[PDB]
Amino acid sequence: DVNTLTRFVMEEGRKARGTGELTQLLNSLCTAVKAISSAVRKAGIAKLDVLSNDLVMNMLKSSFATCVLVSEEDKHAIIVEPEKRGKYVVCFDPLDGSSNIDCLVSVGTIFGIYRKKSTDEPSEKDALQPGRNLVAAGYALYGSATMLVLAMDCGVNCFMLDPAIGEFILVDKDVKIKKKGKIYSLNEGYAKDFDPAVTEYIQRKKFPPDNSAPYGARYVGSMVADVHRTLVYGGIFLYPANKKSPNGKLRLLYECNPMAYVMEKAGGMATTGKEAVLDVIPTDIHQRAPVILGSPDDVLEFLKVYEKHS
Amino acid sequence: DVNTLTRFVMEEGRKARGTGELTQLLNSLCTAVKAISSAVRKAGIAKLDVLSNDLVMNMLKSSFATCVLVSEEDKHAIIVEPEKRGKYVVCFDPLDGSSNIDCLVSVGTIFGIYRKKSTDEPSEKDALQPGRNLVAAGYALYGSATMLVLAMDCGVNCFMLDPAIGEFILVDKDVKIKKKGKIYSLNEGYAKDFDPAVTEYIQRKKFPPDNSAPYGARYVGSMVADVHRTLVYGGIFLYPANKKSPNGKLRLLYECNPMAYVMEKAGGMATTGKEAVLDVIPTDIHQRAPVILGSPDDVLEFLKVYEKHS
Amino acid sequence: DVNTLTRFVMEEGRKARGTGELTQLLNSLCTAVKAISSAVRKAGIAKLDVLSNDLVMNMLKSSFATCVLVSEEDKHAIIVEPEKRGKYVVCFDPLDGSSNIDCLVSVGTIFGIYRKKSTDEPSEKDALQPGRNLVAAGYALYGSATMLVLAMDCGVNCFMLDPAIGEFILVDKDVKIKKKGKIYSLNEGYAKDFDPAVTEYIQRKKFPPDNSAPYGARYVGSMVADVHRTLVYGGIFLYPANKKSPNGKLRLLYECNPMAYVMEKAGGMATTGKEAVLDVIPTDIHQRAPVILGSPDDVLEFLKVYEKHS
Amino acid sequence: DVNTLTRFVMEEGRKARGTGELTQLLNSLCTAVKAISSAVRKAGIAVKKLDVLSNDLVMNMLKSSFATCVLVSEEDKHAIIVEPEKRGKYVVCFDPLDGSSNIDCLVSVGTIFGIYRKKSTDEPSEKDALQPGRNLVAAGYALYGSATMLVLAMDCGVNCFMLDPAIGEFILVDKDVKIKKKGKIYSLNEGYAKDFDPAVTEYIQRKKFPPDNSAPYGARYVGSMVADVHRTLVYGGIFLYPANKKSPNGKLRLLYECNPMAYVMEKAGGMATTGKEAVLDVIPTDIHQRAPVILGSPDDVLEFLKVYEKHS
Ligand SMILES: CCc1cc(S(=O)(=O)NC(=O)Nc2ncc(Br)s2)ccc1-c1ccccc1
Ligand SMILES: CCc1cc(S(=O)(=O)NC(=O)Nc2ncc(Br)s2)ccc1-c1ccccc1
Ligand SMILES: CCc1cc(S(=O)(=O)NC(=O)Nc2ncc(Br)s2)ccc1-c1ccccc1
Ligand SMILES: CCc1cc(S(=O)(=O)NC(=O)Nc2ncc(Br)s2)ccc1-c1ccccc1
């Protein structure tokens, strides 16, 4: 039957007899996503990551379901005024890949939603929860089409934006990543700076000792695109720690965690090398994390080589 | 001032006091792109590159400006019935990258336009001209926005589709690629099969001898996106012959030739390793060709290593 | 603040802590509205009031909020299957004015929503309520822009569809009709059959006795266009009882009743001449009704003239 | 085969071996229509009022076409003389958003245009816009209704195009339209019946109460000229905005409302009169002068003109 994101969220929200605050929040995000999608298709005529930031910021503020908002674009967390204050914490990158938008390759919005756990007054620390605590997370990918991928406790669902009616149509129910993929994704230009484990794992994808087929390589350089491909076709994506960047480069709160959550809810894995990404407890909201995610056999096989190098 | 694609082609067409057949052909092409763009932003829905083929076929056949049409989706060249017959030959990929559209990564339309050179009755042979003979070429990239790249004798111009009004807006007049880039683009999964020249060139990009910065890596795997990025940012793109596809992989008539034409007309280069791409005289409509294209300094620096290897 | 139909409808439902079934009904209705609009902007291109009925029919059936559906296009009431059964009855014209769409004049969707009366099997009898029992009613007007007019207990609100984002933006909060207008609206070609009371009232509008300005005449003949203009500019709309048609022409259940409800909730009036439209108790789901509605001073002035005529 | 406005106009322009200045002008016009159509469908989500943008939209699209020298608009008191670098050979009279005082009620709005070729070799001036309607090269209207329709009348005839919003192309949906010989619908404001010229009261009375006791006509009046005329074209009948004694010259403007509708009507086999003459034969003395107009099906306008004769 015909399913929309807005119908989907109402059915499950009625099922659980919750107050509606999350359903309101998600509609607020999803309405913001359509706006960003619309501006991104004419992005150039007559900044853009600032429109996207203010759009999400204000649609979230006025949903009455948020108390603390963390954005890549703001130095400190945003504390909602008391009259509009609600029960959830939101971390989001409003336009990831906006530095690589001239080449018109994919850009995206990534979000993670937490519950405020304490009853203290809202502060920056309410966003410093571990990824395990995520209530809902996912991304909008503004590509050949606009797709919203929503991961929650029940699982991962893919909605396609139909611009003719401005509704997110359910196109992939409860998606589950392949156990093992045939594709690897990372920037090999920085091979000069690779941790030796990364060097060895990549060589094994290009030169298998067991004389099976070598893997293919893809790297758009936009995290939303690279991860979505890992989700849909299977494989491995790596933005790992090198010796210059000992904690990786991507941000934990609003890039690594929501992708780690989506992966895990699809049956995949997501690590820093040392632990699961979702078990890292943040002390800084803009802190970084290495990330290797994808099919469990591939993330495990990478972990097998990571173990070898001390 | 405000310029549209339809206006631009007519102004250059009026300037040359030509018959109007090419202007009609280009509008029939550009109208086709707008339909394809619509289809791609609304994909999924429970095959699509066949829509794109038949759209382009019928838009061209009824332009009265075409006589022989070569498409990736058809085994033989298409010979237009005489009542609609015209003076131009069109080679085209109606949806390049349509096998990687589940990942919502770029899809695109590539086209090459020849005036029929022989005076026989039209046949497949009329499509076997070399790229040097191209009158017009370019691509539509269905990405975060739909962008049309039109290369002609005067130079390269980029038009962005405005979806509110369905017009291609001029956003880049007389584009010129960077003299040298910082990005190389290829599938390194075929590393086991690389010609030593590609192997050495790639080694120089990751580990420079001159103690400069290594290049970055990008590879979408959809040729329109990689070429468009190379044009917009500079760098070098390679799909060389590996040991599996010894005559290269990309098609000469509608991938290599139109992209080589755009490169060269923007001050760049495009080679097979042995020669320039556009100087190759084709014998088969779906024949393949190795290709290395992009910035002149980068294409040249690769060619230096090709010489070194006999 | 920025308000959309979906955000507004969730807040009113949260405030009153209802089960959510009406909000789902309104959203399924709204999605049908957007779908109809898109088709109405491309009509003629190769009936349509059948697409709209099937569109509303299945959007409502699968809302899980309805049990009985009465349409202008189906002879009997439609009983929703028990798996999809809900507590509300909806009477609607899915595409009002579908006979005059060649002139690109307005078309519309009219709906009225009731609460199920029986606890038996839902049946046609559940649709035979008087207008007073209406939970919600209103119309979508597909004109120069698409407008949704939603009337509830709190009042009447007007929403404008933004097609770039496919969200209904609130543009008119708690609208109230002018006390007295300067425009009258009915078909004067049928003057031959007028009840003498109608003849006298209309003549008073062309030739005022008190030496005031004569009223203007407007008549689109599509009920959604005329009533909305009556709502927004004030005046009176008449499709009265003549002796040839003693029960009027428009259908009571899904044209007169929702329009009367919107009028009354907006500070206006709506009569059969003999009584209020919402006070008529229907005996047939397709029964007819005379209707005179609009600004209260004008309807009263008509009613005082109807009284004079025996 | 499947035809768009842009394909159609190029084919006819190549058939006639012309220079292209007219085709470019029409494309600049079509681009103006699509933009206005998009803005009208969002006529609420708020910087300047809409008819002021529409005027500037059409003004600058025509100026920068290199095909115009004189432009007459409802919103500008004098003709606008195009600067020489962008100067071309055509004159455009247009209403960029007709019916815009009644856009709040979402009833139809429209864009009306008539295009004349500059006749003199003098410097372009306001006088160049004073040609009569017969001299029209091209005219028609955009109706922004439930869908956006482009109606284009030329010497060969009248064609109706549908704006398809997914691709921004005007799709030809009605080739060489022809109005009914006789209709069953009349159109004018009967609120002003107290002020009717005596022939009008008689002709309307004949339509509500026919003497031959045939069927009475139905009445329709939107109050937007584009919609009222367009319904007349498609269904047949008669539209009237005639002269009363209070308004001896009618109300509508000749150069950019009456003339282009008269051209569309006549090229579609219809009629269009002031009562005293055919609309396209009036020789204008002021670019903003008014003219009465009665248009539509050939049989209906004639039955009116016969009543007009009885009255001196
Ligand atoms: C759909 C998301 C969701 C939202 C909420 S809630 O707190 O937002 N409540 C809520 O929306 N109630 C409503 N009542 C009437 C209407 Br109409 S919506 C509670 C649970 C879940 C959920 C998540 C995953 C699986 C299953 C359920
Ligand atoms: C723009 C494409 C083009 C088309 C043609 S043509 O053969 O199609 N003639 C043509 O269109 N004539 C017209 N007359 C009135 C109108 Br309006 S269009 C001839 C030359 C060029 C051209 C190409 C590159 C650089 C400069 C010009
Ligand atoms: C907006 C229409 C409406 C719907 C409903 S309801 O039965 O649909 N319940 C409902 O929506 N609950 C939800 N809780 C959380 C979320 Br998120 S939705 C109850 C009352 C009213 C209402 C009507 C008129 C005035 C004021 C309110
Ligand atoms: C609006 C169509 C039209 C345009 C012109 S023109 O002066 O604009 N020439 C013109 O466009 N030439 C071109 N050359 C290359 C290309 Br591609 S178009 C002349 C006559 C007619 C015409 C009008 C009515 C019926 C039949 C034809």
Automatic annotation (TrEMBL), chains A, B, C:
Beta-D-fructose 1,6-bisphosphate binds at D96, G97, S98, N187, Y190, R218, Y219, M223, Y239, K249, R251. Keywords: Acetylation, Allosteric enzyme, Carbohydrate metabolism, Gluconeogenesis, Hydrolase, Magnesium, Metal-binding, Nucleotide-binding, Phosphoprotein. One of its GO terms (biological process) is gluconeogenesis. One of its GO terms (molecular function) is fructose 1,6-bisphosphate 1-phosphatase activity. AMP binds at V9, T19, G20, E21, L22, T23, K87, Y88. Residues 177-306 form the Fructose-1-6-bisphosphatase class 1 C-terminal domain. Mg(2+) 1 binds at E72, D93, L95. The keyword Hydrolase applies. Gene3D superfamilies: 3.40.190.80, Fructose-1,6-Bisphosphatase, subunit A, domain 1 (3.30.540.10). Its EC number is 3.1.3.11. Pathway: Carbohydrate biosynthesis; gluconeogenesis. Residues 4-172 form the Fructose-1-6-bisphosphatase class I N-terminal domain. The keyword Hydrolase applies. Its cofactor is Mg(2+). It catalyses: beta-D-fructose 1,6-bisphosphate + H2O = beta-D-fructose 6-phosphate + phosphate. CDD domains: FBPase. It holds the Pfam family FBPase_C. Mg(2+) 2 binds at E72, D93, D96, E255. HAMAP family: FBPase_class1 (MF_01855). Homotetramer. Belongs to the FBPase class 1 family. Catalyzes the hydrolysis of fructose 1,6-bisphosphate to fructose 6-phosphate in the presence of divalent cations, acting as a rate-limiting enzyme in gluconeogenesis. Plays a role in regulating glucose sensing and insulin secretion of pancreatic beta-cells. Appears to modulate glycerol gluconeogenesis in liver. Important regulator of appetite and adiposity; increased expression of the protein in liver after nutrient excess increases circulating satiety hormones and reduces appetite-stimulating neuropeptides and thus seems to provide a feedback mechanism to limit weight gain. This is Fructose-1,6-bisphosphatase 1. The gene is FBP1.
